[PDB]
Amino acid sequence: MGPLQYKDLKIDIKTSPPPECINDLLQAVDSQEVRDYCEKKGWIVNITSQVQTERNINRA
Amino acid sequence: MGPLQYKDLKIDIKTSPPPECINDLLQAVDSQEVRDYCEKKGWIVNITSQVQTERNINRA
């Protein structure tokens, strides 16, 4: 199977969350509303495996 | 008046919080525990217009 091109990153300004300011933050105040928010914002502070992009490239 | 004798403000030190990732974050999930944490961490994310709710509560 295959969800997407599944390979190196190819974006830039849109969905972080590499600048772990929320998780490094909320990793101490227990508050998924802040991370649920962060990933609501668009960082996704949580993991770097299951990602979903809206601008596919297979066709572009 | 102010919170105290607020003076000397032309450096930066390890205390941010200009990178408003917590406040820009927590400004939407209502969670002073994250900012109380952020300023506990050392950013101090907190606008200074006319707030006077005796911050720095006794969390220890």
Side-chain angles (χ1 to χ4, degrees), chain A residues 19-29 31-35 37-38 41 43, chain B residues 19-31 33-35 37-38 41 43:
Chain A
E20 42 155 52
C21 13
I22 303 353
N23 67 319
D24 191 354
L25 150 105
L26 163 64
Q27 283 262 331
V29 31
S31 221
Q32 207 139 56
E33 313 239 297
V34 141
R35 246 218 167 169
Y37 153 95
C38 193
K41 304 336 278 166
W43 323 32
Chain B
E20 41 156 53
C21 13
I22 303 353
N23 67 319
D24 190 355
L25 149 103
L26 163 63
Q27 284 262 328
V29 32
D30 270 2
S31 222
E33 314 241 284
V34 132
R35 245 216 167 164
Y37 152 96
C38 192
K41 304 336 278 165
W43 322 34

Side-chain angles (χ1 to χ4, degrees), chain B residues 1-40:
Chain B
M1 258 287 276
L4 237 150
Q5 73 211 53
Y6 202 120
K7 228 76 172 217
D8 241 313
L9 55 142
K10 187 129 59 241
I11 64 190
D12 226 326
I13 316 170
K14 305 253 212 298
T15 46
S16 301
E20 41 156 53
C21 13
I22 303 353
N23 67 319
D24 190 355
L25 149 103
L26 163 63
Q27 284 262 328
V29 32
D30 270 2
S31 222
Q32 210 138 54
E33 314 241 284
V34 132
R35 245 216 167 164
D36 193 57
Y37 152 96
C38 192
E39 58 107 295
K40 176 162 135 85

